[PDB]
Symmetry: D2
Subunit: 115 residues, 4 copies
């Protein structure tokens, strides 16, 4: 698994479950082309988005649908989503974990990159 996404809820102290996540890759023509998408599991993890063959060099954007998450929970949050944008595989394949911690008016995001 070259790309994994982990999301936690800082209000509840729990995994953020059933969060939609869409991944895009910047195309030749500068557009954001759809790449893969999925939903976080009961452990707040999203696996199986892609494969080492598919996950080529490029600029990727991982958009986490934090607004739908808070709304499903009856809360009106500030951000539309949380998007993480990075160049991947510049020096060869790496494994990327994108972790996000969500509050209604705040989020943070970190990347763990291993070889």
């Amino acid at each position: 698994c070259p790309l994994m996404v982990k999301v936690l809820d800082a209000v509840r102290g729990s995994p953020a479950i059933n969060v939609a996540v869409h991944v895009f890759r910047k195309a030749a023509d500068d557009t954001w082309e759809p790449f893969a998408s999925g939903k976080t599991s009961e452990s707040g993890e999203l696996h199986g988005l892609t494969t080492e063959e598919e996950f080529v060099e490029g600029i990727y954007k991982v958009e986490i649908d934090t607004k739908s998450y808070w709304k499903a929970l009856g809360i009106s949050p500030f951000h539309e989503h949380a998007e993480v944008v990075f160049t991947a595989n510049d020096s060869g394949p790496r494994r990327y974990t994108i972790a996000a911690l969500l509050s209604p008016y705040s989020y943070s995001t970190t990347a763990v990159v291993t070889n």
Copy 2:
């Protein structure tokens, strides 16, 4: 000044000075149109982006050029930039501060909505 941006550097424990910030408003065709931009000051703050009469309800994107900031310091960074996307909602008089705390592989952002 209904919209201010403040950026701090978690590695040096200082304001993040001279960071480029571009603000876009979502247009009816779903493209992002330039709205306002500037460089943060010596105090990591960016004032005077817009006025109340110009700043109407809508979806806005604040893009912070974290990549250039880290490179100008000789530090290798993960993210291409940091994008903060939110709906400006008239519910009240409504000053928005978008604050961001930067690390090479991580950032956080919070909104402080007052008055």
Copy 3:
């Protein structure tokens, strides 16, 4: 004012108002002796804790009563408080801002050391 504390609320997207903050200095026998304290203001800020002549090098603990803050809002919190422990080092003229961003089950803190 060589030492200031600023606290924000990530759930409401506001300053954290009226939060109790106690500052201790580590004594030679390793106990924490009271040094300064106060409640954050309407802007989530706490000024006037100490003066340059009183604030000597040493280890200081800043304890932020996050538990009372959440309870006064009717929100269930995880941490008993937030403690920020650091060495004040004369290397330069040296204003310290200790900033904290609070969630029910999470907080972050950053130091901004300027001048």
Copy 4:
């Protein structure tokens, strides 16, 4: 495993490896009595600190030795340590993951609590 600690490095985008962690429990007499201690593994995780029999109700403090971590890496950080203090098992046994994300002048910490 009732108590686990996970630490990440936000500068490198990696697990924070070989971080010392000491756990204390507030005694009858209001003192912090040593409870368990360990070091994070190659994955930045610390397992096996305690058992469901040992990990009784109480107020616990998990002190993460972030200063030694940065120093080993040739860096002079701001904080002495990062301490997390919480009441555990008030409504019966729970499993607690204390996660911390470290930068030289900043850290955040979150708790994931599951039943």
